[PDB]
Structure formats: C-alpha cells, structure tokens
Amino acid sequence: GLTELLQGYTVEVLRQQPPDLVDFAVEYFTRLREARRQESDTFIVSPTTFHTQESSAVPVIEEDGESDSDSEDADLEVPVPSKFTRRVSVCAETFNPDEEEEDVVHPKTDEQRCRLQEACKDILLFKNLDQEQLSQVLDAMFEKIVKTDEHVIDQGDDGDNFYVIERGTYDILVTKDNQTRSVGQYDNRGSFGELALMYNTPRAATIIATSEGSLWGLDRVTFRRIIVKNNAKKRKMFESFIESVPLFKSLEMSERMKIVDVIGEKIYKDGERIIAQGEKADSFYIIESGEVSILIRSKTKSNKNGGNQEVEIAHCHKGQYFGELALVTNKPRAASAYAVGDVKCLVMDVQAFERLLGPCMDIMKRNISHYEEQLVKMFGSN
Amino acid sequence: GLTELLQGYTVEVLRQQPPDLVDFAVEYFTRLREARRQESDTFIVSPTTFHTQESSAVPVIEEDGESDSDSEDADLEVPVPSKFTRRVSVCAETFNPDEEEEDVVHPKTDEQRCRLQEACKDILLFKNLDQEQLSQVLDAMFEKIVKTDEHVIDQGDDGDNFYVIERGTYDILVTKDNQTRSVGQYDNRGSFGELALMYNTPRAATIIATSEGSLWGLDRVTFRRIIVKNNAKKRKMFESFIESVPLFKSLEMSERMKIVDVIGEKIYKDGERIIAQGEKADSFYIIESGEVSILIRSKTKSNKNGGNQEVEIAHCHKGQYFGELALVTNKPRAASAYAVGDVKCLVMDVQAFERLLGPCMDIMKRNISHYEEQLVKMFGSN
Amino acid sequence: YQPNYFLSIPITNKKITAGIKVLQNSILRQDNRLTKAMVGDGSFHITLLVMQLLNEDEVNIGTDALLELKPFVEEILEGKHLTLPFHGIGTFQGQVGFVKLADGDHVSALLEIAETAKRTFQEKGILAGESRTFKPHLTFMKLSKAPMLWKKGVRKIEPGLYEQFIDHRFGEEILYQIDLCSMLKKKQSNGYYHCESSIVIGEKDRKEPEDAELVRLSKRLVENAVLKAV
Amino acid sequence: ESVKEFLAKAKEDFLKKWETPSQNTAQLDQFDRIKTLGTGSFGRVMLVKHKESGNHYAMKILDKQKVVKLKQIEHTLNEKRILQAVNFPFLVKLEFSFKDNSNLYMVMEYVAGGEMFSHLRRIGRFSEPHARFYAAQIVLTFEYLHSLDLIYRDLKPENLLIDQQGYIQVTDFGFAKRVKGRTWTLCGTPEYLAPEIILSKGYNKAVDWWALGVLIYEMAAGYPPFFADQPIQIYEKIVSGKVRFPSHFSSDLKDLLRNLLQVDLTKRFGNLKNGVNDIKNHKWFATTDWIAIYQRKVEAPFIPKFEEEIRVSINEKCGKEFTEF
Amino acid sequence: ESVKEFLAKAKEDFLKKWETPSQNTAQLDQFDRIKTLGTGSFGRVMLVKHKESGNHYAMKILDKQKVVKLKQIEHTLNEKRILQAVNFPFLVKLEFSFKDNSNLYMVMEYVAGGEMFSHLRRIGRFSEPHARFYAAQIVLTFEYLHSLDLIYRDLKPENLLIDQQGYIQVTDFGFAKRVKGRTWTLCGTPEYLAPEIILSKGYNKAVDWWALGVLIYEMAAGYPPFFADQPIQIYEKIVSGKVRFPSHFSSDLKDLLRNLLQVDLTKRFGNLKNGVNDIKNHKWFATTDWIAIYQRKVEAPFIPKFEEEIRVSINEKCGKEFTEF
C-alpha cells in the first residue's frame, strides 16, 4: 500500500502545483484520513461443483480355471461285530494203563472217611465207582488246612484239584464281565472243582475261607491213575475168566473184550440162592471165587409126583460156569443154584451176548473139529 | 523538494512500521508542517550608484620604443640679454593739425585754478605756453578722487596722464632690480608723470595714496590736440598778416613760414610807447589789432631849434606795419610810436630777418615791375 | 562451444556510462598500464544470450529469431517496464571487473527473457545459450584484453583500485532495444558492437498509446523515492 | 463183496506203510511260499506252491525244538505215522514230509473250500437229505479207519472241511490212534465225548460211532444233543443218555439216533454183531448209494466259496530223538 | 651748376614716380628664400635670392591683416610710396614691391655690411676726418631729400648701415614724410629730438639739420650732446640748448656744431638764407670733395665685416583698402 498511497498524493501535487508540499500533504491525507468506506462487501459462498465426463479405456484378458471337489461323511460304529471265532478239544494227561509195577499216605478217621463218602455220593465221577476204587481214592485224598481270608481257588486260575470241605466257612464269588457277585457261602459242608479231575481248565469261581478250616483235596493225575489202573486190572482179570472158558475159545480177542466191556459182577453170601429152578433163564455165570451147589427137586421126572425135596446135580468152583443152557435154549431153569460160602460170579445177559456176538450155537461151530465135543458138553450126560 | 519529502516519510514508515499508513501520514506531515525555520538573510545598501559598463575584451599588442633623456639643474634665469642696448624710436599719436571744425568741461574755482597754474610754472611743456593755451589746458584737466591705499600709478604700467595733487598724502616707490624703496612722500603738493604727455612709455615709479585725496589729471591726447590746434591756428593767422603786407608779396610760401616760425607778439596798453625816436631801429611791426600813432618832435628839421613838441606824421591800424625803415637803413628811429588804445603787434627782428631771407632790398627787387612802386613806398612822401 | 554472436541490451542511460568512464579513469590514474584492459567507450552492454551464427543464412536466421522473440518479451513483461539498477562492483576471479546488477524482481524477469530467447533461437536451428547459470553483469574491464599485463606482473585486478565505487549507484536502464551483435566483426564508429539487427520491446512502451499524460510519472517519482529511502 | 476186497487190499497197503513209515520224502527247495494262514493259538501253517508240477499244498511248520513242551510230543510223532500210512477219499493227505534242524514239516494237501462249522452255523441246520449225504461219508471213513484198528476220536463240525466238489474232507488227527484192545486217554471235545471216556472204563471203536450220533443230531438240529452252559452238566446229561429230539425230526432219524447214542454198549450201532452194517442198512440210509458216495459221483448239496520268512539253524538239533519221521 | 641740374632732374624723376606709384612690380615666384633674419620686436624680414639674375635682397613680410593695429597703417602705406619714388646713392632701395592676400611685401636691396651703431660703440669714437667722411654723406642725402620736400626725422647711428664699400646707406623710413609747409607728429629718438618737436611748435626741414648736429657730435665724442639717464632731463637739456664740448674737439668742429645745435631757428645752419651751403662751406668741411663723396670715389676709413615657411590665404583679404600699393 505504501507506493499506491503516495502515488495519489503525488498525482495531485503534479496536477495542482501547490506552493507548500507539506501543507498540501496534511490536507490530502486528512481528507483521505477520514477513511470512511461508502460500501464494503463480506460474502459467504456455498460449495460449488463442476461436472466432467471421463475418457474410456479397453482391457482384454481371458482366464480359465479347472478343479474337482469330493466330500465324505461318517457314522456311528454300531452295529458291533457278532460272530464267535472258535471251539476247542480237551485232553487229559496220558498214562500207561497196564500196571507198571507196584512202586499216597494220608491218615483219616472212620468219621472223616465216612463223611467223605457221603459228600461224594452224587458226584458223577464217584457216583458209580466200586467199593475198592472209592477206598483207594479216599486214601489218596490229602488234607489242606486253610486260614481265614485265604483263597482256596481263584476264578480263571488253572485247576488241578477237587476239594471236600472238612471244617470252616467259605464265601463263593463269581465274576461275570466287570461284575463280581458274592453269590453263596459254605458252612462246614460242600465240595467243588470236580471238573478239574477230568482235564485242566480255568476255575469258574473264586472261593475264600472266612475262618480257619480244613479241606480234603484230590489231584487229577492221582485220581485218574488210580481209576484207570484199577479198571485195566479188572479188564485183564475178566478177560482171563472168559478165556479159560472152553465154550468161548473160538472167540476172537476183540469179541472177548466186547463181553468184558459190559459183563457184570455179583457177590453172594454163603447159602443164598443165585438161580431158582423154574424162573426164566436170562443169563449165565462164571465163578471167579467160592463154590456153587446146583440142586434139582426130583419131580419133573415122570408124570406127576415124587422126591419133591433137594438133590445136588453138580458142584462148581473157581473158573467154572453155570446157567450155560440159557445161551442155547429157552426153557425155564432146570435146577436151582446156591452159593456154597462166599461167592463172586461174572454175570452175562444172554440177549446182550447175542446182540454183540450173535447166537452161541454158531460160535460153538466155528471150530468144526470141536463142534461134537462142545455139543456133548452142553447137552450131554455129566 | 518532492522526492525528498516522499523519502523522509518513507524512512520513518520503515523505522516505525505503523499499521495505518494514512494515520501515520497525517501525524508525520502535521509534525513536519510547522517546519521552523525557513530562512535567514542580511540586508544592506549597495550602495546603488550609476556606473559605466563593466566588461570589455582586451586586445593584446607588442610594441618597442627608444628615448633621449636630458637632465639638468633648474635655475630661475630671471636675467637674460637684453643684448640691446639699442635706442628705440618714440612716436605720439598723429593728428590733423588744421582745425577739423569746432565739434571737455571740468569745473574749477579761482583758488584751484590759480593753484594749478603755480604747480605748473616749471614743467617744461607748460613753462612757456601763452595765456590762452594754458587756460584751455587747465580747462581740460579732469578731477580724480582717490581713497587711501589706492595706487595712482604703478611702475611699469603704460602712462597716459599727468597728475597734479589737489589734496592728500602719497608715498612714492621705486623698484630697482629686485629691490623696492619707499623713496619719498607728497603732502598735498606735487605733480608727476609729465613724460606721459609726450608719448606712451612705462611708468618709472609707483605712487600710492595714504589718505583720501584729489588729483587733477591730464590726458596726453587731449593735451597735444589743444596745443597743436592752437599753434596751427596761430600760424595760419601770422601767415595772413605777413601775406597781406605788400612789401613781402614776392616772398615764397616757405619763406613766409620761416618768419612765422620765429616772429614775436607783444601787447601794448593804450598810450604806452612802442618805438622811441632816436633809439636804434632793430625791428619792424605789423599791427594785428588796435591803432598806433607815429609822432615826431620837429627839431631835426634845419640847423639847431624849433617845434620841440609833438606832431603826428601817420596813424596805423589793423594790418598795417611801421618801423619798416629798419629793414633798409641803419639810422636812429626818425619818430616815436605810441599805442592808440589796446594794441597787439607782430614784432620781427631785422637781423634775424636778414639771416633767414637775406637783405630786404633784394626781396623788393625780385618782382621788377613793382620795384619802383616799392621804392616810392619806402622812401617816398606819404 | 565458442560463441561468435550475442543478444545485447545496450546501455543507453548516459549517467551509467558516464559513471563507468569515471570509474575506469580513476583506476587508470592509479595504474596507467591497465589502459588496454578497459572496455571501449560506446561498447557497454548486458549480454542476454550467446550463440553461434556460422554463415550468411544463419545470420539471417538469427535476425528472424530476434524478430520472433519480440512478442514473447512483451508477453513476459505484462505491461510493466523492466528496470535494471546498476549498483556496486564485482569481479570474476579478479580477471574481469563489472558493475553489478542490483537484486530485485527484475532479475527473475530478465532470466525468463534469457531462457525464452534461448528456446526461440534453438527452435530456429541456432546453437544458443549455455549450461552455466545466467548471471548478468556490466563488464568494464578484462585483463585478457591486455596480454602484456601477465608478461609484466599484473595478474589480477587489485580490489583497492575500485574501493570508492563499491556502493556507487551508476543508474538505471529500462529495457527497450535488444541488438543482435557480432563479437568478432569491426566495431561501429561510436564504439558499439557491429549490429546485424535490432528490435525494440517498447510500445514504446505503454499499455495505452494515448498520453496519460504524464500521470504514470508519479509512479516513477514515488518508486524512486522509496528506493532511495532504503 | 468188493467191500472185503477193498478193505483187504486196504489193510495190506496200510500195514506196509505203517511198518515202514515214509520218512523225509521231498526237499524244501522244491516248494516256494505264498500266503501264511496258520496262526490261531498253536502251530505255524503257511500256504505254498510246487516247482515242476506247481501245485498248492498246506505246510505245517513244527519247530523240532518247539516240541518237548506243550502237552505231548508223541501224539504227533504218532500222528505223522498214521497220516502217511492211510489212504481214503474223505481224508486229508500227507503229501510230503521232511525235517533237518528245521525239522518236521508237514506238506498236507490243500482244498480251497469251506469249513463245516461255518456253513452249518450260518444256515442253522441241514435238511435230513443233506445231512444224510455228509453222514454217509463219515460212516465210510470210519469203516475204513476201524478196518485198520484206528480210532479218530475228535469228530466234530470244526474238524470237517467241505472241498470244492462239495464233499467232506476230514482234518486234524491229533487224537488218532491205532488200538487193538482198549485205550484210555480222556480226550476229544466236551459235546462229543462218550460216556465210557468220561468215566474211564476203557474204550476203542465204539466212541467214534457215538460221536457220529452226536454229529448227525447237530447237523439236523443245529445244536448238539447234550448241550449245556456248564461242562459238568454236559457230561451228566451224556452219562444219563436221555435225549430229546426236535419236533421236525423224522421217525427213521430218531430211531437211528437212539441206536447211535446208546449209553449201553450192548445196544450201540456199530458195536454189535454186524458192526457198521447195522448203520448202513438202517431205514434212514435206505436212499443212500454207498458206492456212489465213495466214488464221489453223487451231487453235493452245497459248493463252498473259492506273514514272514523263517529259516533253519544250519544245524540239526532235536534230531537225536525225532529220528523216526 | 650741376647741383641745380641734378636736383631739377631729380625732382622730375621723383614727382613722376610720386604721382604714379609703381605698384605690385615683381612676382613672388621669381624669388626663393634663404636665411630669416628679421625678428627683433616687430615685422618679419627674411633674406632671399633671385631667379634669372640670382641676386640677394631683403624682403620685409607685412601681413596685410597684421596691420590695422599697432600704431598706424599709413606711416607705412606712405613709407612705401616714398621709398619707391626716391633715388640716391646713400639711400636703401625698394627693389620690388608686391601684394595679394599675402599682401605687402617689400623687396629691399641688400648690403652684407655692418651697422653704424655697433662700429661706433666698439671703437668709442671716430676721428674727426672719419666723422667728416660720414657726415658729408648725410648732408648730401638731406639736400636731396629736402629738394623733394621730404623729411627723414629719425637720424641716428641705429638707422645707418655701412656697406661693403665702406659708405653709408640710410635705412628705415618709418617717419619719412613729404611736407611743404609744417608738420606736427612728435616722433624720432629721444636723444635726437629737436626743441620744436618736443614743444609742438610745428616744424619741417630744420629738424633734420639739428639731428645731424647731434649725429656729428656723437660720432666725434662717442656720446650724444644732451645725454641723461632720464628722458625728461634729456629734453630739458635739449630745450636749454646749452652744450659742453669735449677737450679734444677742434675749433672748426665746435663752431659748426654750435650752428647746427641752434635752438634759435634764425641762427640754425641749413635753415638760413643759403640753406645747405652754410654747412657745405663751413671750415670743418673744407677738405671735403663733395662730388667725390657723391660718386663714392673717396676711400672710406673702414670696410665692415662680410626660420620657417609661411604661405598665403589663397584669398585676398585687406585688399579692400591697401589698394594703393
């Protein structure tokens, strides 16, 4: 502003040629000095927008994409598998049945032994054993003392013995899957583990003593050996009594064994009747000990009457046989037979004999050079 | 002053940085505006005066010269020849002597005139002047009054007048060479300057009045004219009385003038004797006025005796002459002559007459036809 | 390259050239053997643009380019005179002595004119201008002009020689004439460079042909008073 | 009849091989190796192929040393002697036998067929005609075996294979034993044990016939005649001999079975006077052509569906006892 | 006698030239100019030479205008008329006269001789014989002049020149005047004035003779008879006529002088009956041969020793009065 301010003054000085420049300056700027403005403008402007149109452009590209998608889904496991894989054979320990050569001592009072017998009556392996074998078996039973809280047998464990309770109380437990149930108790009575006498197999339950007690035990091997040995001895003995009987000489080994398999034994006290005259002849006997008296009441000798008493036709001993006619005929017994003292006979049923070997008459003829002899023996005089 | 004004404001705007340049200008120029003090001056007189134009171009010139110098002592050189020492002629003013035709009045009392005569007795020019001329001369003397301290005459000055003192005292001075001497005084008596009446010549002394005085003066020209005129008139008159005398008719003009030059005059009072009978005859007379009686005492007529008385032989008048015989003889006078009334005669000496013209007898004979007549007149009867 | 031609702004303000004459003479009274180093009377100028004109056609082309430049310089000045104030003295390494161009708005305008000049000439095929910065100055002496000076011990301009003119205002030149000058041809009678052609910037020069008249002068008087107060 | 001919020639052929076992026959380098199906719970049986002939066989790997433990080492040394001496159409075959430091390798024949146990269990039970078909094969096999005084002792679905021809092939002679007289080992399978075995009375050929009765019953019923959850009860039932037959069992079948499952040896079929003819001539087998079944000419009712690297010891070990092999 | 002849012829010659003055005779261009001795205290006299004849003359320059002042202008116009009309051997000569705007120029003869005044004063006084010689010349000159009724009136040593022949030549006719009758101007030289002049009685020829007496006395004595320091005393002595003669004066001289210096005109020589013969026949002049002196044949007793450029007015001035010249 300085140059323009002073230019207005200087224009007027040049135009007006005043004689006193300073006085002219006082007047000029004083008149300028009032500085009144006739008009002034103050303005506010709204925003203003200008519109343009933009230029075009061209873009060129081609793109191709290839992909393949697959999905899978899953399910609950059930149903579970159903099938069961296998079954199995069993086998006990082998043993030479035929007696090796004589080569178990556990004391027992009468009451104890008597009680063991009772406890064993119903066990199938014992149920039908003869007097002797049962004795040898009880002899072999060893005692086992048990203190309270002790496990006699534990489920799953291998088994070798059978036990009879002598004294004490016991709890029986059975685990099925993950559960164990105290199923029952024994109070000074009982037996268990019979299966162990057959073959080795897992114990099916656990038995724990709940007091001081005593049990009689029996080991499988000992039990099997006692029994087999005895039955194999009996067989050899039966075999001999059949073999020495001439009527059966034409029999083959295997045929004698079929007899041995089924033939019976009977004990008779002196004087008791074995065969009664008149009843039906179903079997024959072979004396293995003692003697037998054969009597006939002499009446069936004529036409009505007579003797009607007692007459001894024959008298047999160890190794002999009687009742043979039941094998070749079907008429009532001709005479009665009584035990002369203590007797033991092998008893064979005729019908069983025939089913096994066929009729006796054919056997007698097998060996033709002895057929006559045999015939005279069976239907002859003496 | 415009740029300086704008600059000074701008310098203060730059220093002070005023936000409002217009208010700053009002204040700046107002403060500046009084602006004391503009000027100081001294006013004095030029002093203004008229002057010749101040400036000229100056010419340049070259010149050379030569000189003669004379050096001398200085002297008055008052006295220088003066070689002559030669006598110079003098001359008065000329004048027609013969009376022009009647064509000076200064009053004087008897005592004054009488005193002038006395003062003039011895002056040579006046000494032997007749009664008439002296009178005419005194008549012509004019009065000159002088105041004390005044110079009557000054040595050296030209002279024209002669002076007679009437009254007063005077000092006489004479300068010889460089010296002036108060040589003498006059006390109411005196005269001086006589030479001036002859010709013009330098005054030989200076006369100064020492009191109020009076002097009678006479101018040369007036004095000479009075005298010449009168003597020339007298001459003409004498000439006439000689001319009318028949005895002298044969005389030439120049011869009559020689007589006129020397002839005398005499006045006789009535009755007085002019010529006495018996004395020697030396001259002759010519009456110019009056009458003369000629007497003779009749005794010289015989031989001793007689008359011895008085007898008148002749009686002459104006123009006549007597005593003529003295011119032709040498005997005593024959008769006496007496003046009859107042007489004036011209008297001529015979001896002078002869020396001048020779003997009278020869003159009488000059004119021969009148010789006889003349002779009878001189020695004749009447 | 070596130029042989230039655009010249002649110094026409007699006060400037008279002041330089005084400067030159004062130096010479101190050391008279600097005589031939002084630039000649009548030669004073500002160089606006250097160039090469190497034949008759190119000399004509230069003249054409100068004519074409005129309207451009008029455009640049935007109705105001270009005033060049010359104040003080400088040297280029003690070998060239010059009156300085005072700083101000005029320097940028002058530079703009120089660059537009360079472009105009090059577009007509003339090698013109330089790569170095345009630094206008008014030369008054050059030692190279007097080769014998080296040869006798004077190898720089003594700064003391021009001490009294160090802040001397020489004067102001208003741009008007622009001359196309030959560096190598014989100088004119008046001392100036040989001139092929000239243009005049001025209208001459006013926004309006008609007289204001003299109204503008108030602007000149005020602007000058303000410059003097600084 | 030819029956006698066959058996006579049979006993001859058998006694010859029995009294002179064919030891170490083929060489291990003649057979390669394929799959290895022979795990289970004992023994190492792996499939194998032949060289020149290029046949398939089932080789049982029995480490000479592996023996000595277990249950027995004779029930095998004996088993081998029998397999080698016998020859029947419904019996598996010991093709090649050999040993040496490896020792005792059994090269059994191979039939890519199915198990009898799996088939029977799937379908539940066989129709009587179909059951009679398999039964006939076992009767004939037992007649042959007993002719040589050999008892099988382990009859059961599990030990019977159905070959690709649909005929039975008997396997596993673990309990097979030559016995003239009586024997006593308590062995077999619970369900199939004879009363005499359970009770140790001594026995021989009769147990095989009892087992047959059990086998026939299970085939026609789907389950064995003396089944029970506890082994003890099975035996008590076996000993009582009491049997209950399904409603659908025919009369002829029930009768035959009452005679096979006889606890009384005097009444058991096969053990009586006529032996195996009491069985062959039974009304249940009337529509059976015994020769036809023998020659495998009858049309079976069902055609079945169809590892590591061990080494020797470079030295023979237990060969100081397994000589006979 | 010839005396009468001479004078008669003389008067004739004179009256002729007197009644018809020879005016403007020669021309100024016939005479040149030499020295210029003519100052003193009046007039301008300059020497001059002639053309054809080439003679020397003394020309008096009288400016026609210069006149009119001074003392008189007739004592000259008259002087000229006389010089021209007279002719005598002991008288200077007016050779040529002329005028015109210059006007009045006197061409007097020239004798390169000496002045009488200078000669007499130097030697003091002349011897009587020598004095008688000069005297005779003056007597003769006066007889001639008086014959023409002309009186000189200025006799004195100063106005007498001694020519180269030793004879007298009279100059300066300033006071010369023709008078028949009587005249009256008081003029001359103090020492030489006659009583009648001093006293104004009128006079004529007698004064010249008185002057001669004075002139003769001074020559023989050295000083004039009535000398005195004051003019007044000179005249009083002159009037008294008393004279005292030096001791050396001879008798004849004293007598002659008593007769010349006669105050009484009836007794003065020259004025009496015989005129100039009373003088010529005096005993003092007895040894004088008058004719001889006239013809200048006698031997004189003493032979004497032997500027600017003016112009006319180109116009005649005072010629309106100086006609007669």
Author numbering:
A (entry chain C), B (entry chain B): 9 to 111, 116 to 394
C (entry chain A): 88 to 317
D (entry chain E), E (entry chain D): 13 to 318, 332 to 350
What does the paper say about this structure?
The PKA holoenzyme is a tetramer composed of two regulatory subunits (R) and two autoinhibited catalytic subunits (PKAc). The local action of PKA is dictated by A-kinase anchoring proteins (AKAPs) that impose spatial constraint by tethering this kinase in proximity to substrates. Here we have used electron microscopy (EM) to evaluate the topological arrangement of the fully assembled type IIα PKA holoenzyme when anchored to AKAP18γ.
Class averages revealed a remarkable variety of configurations. These ranged from a tightly packed pseudo-symmetric triangular configuration to a fully extended linear configuration of the three densities. However, inspection of particles at various tilt angles showed that particles of linear and triangular conformations remained clearly distinguishable, even at high tilt angles. In both 3D reconstructions, a central mass with dimensions of 60 × 60 × 80 Å (corresponding to the site of AKAP18γ as demonstrated by affinity gold labeling, black triangle and Figure 1D, inset) was flanked on either side by larger densities of 100 × 100 × 85 Å. In the triangular conformation, the two peripheral densities are oriented at a 100° angle with respect to the central density and exhibit an end-to-end length of ∼300 Å (top). The end-to-end length increases to ∼385 Å in the extended linear configuration (bottom). Moreover, this back-projection analysis demonstrated that when the triangular model is tilted completely on its edge (where it may appear more linear in projection) its dimensions (max length = 300 Å) are significantly smaller than the maximum end-to-end length obtained for the linear reconstruction (max length = 385 Å). In a similar manner, the peripheral densities each accommodate a PKA sub-structure consisting of one catalytic subunit (blue) in complex with the cAMP-binding domain of RIIα, residues 91–392 (green).
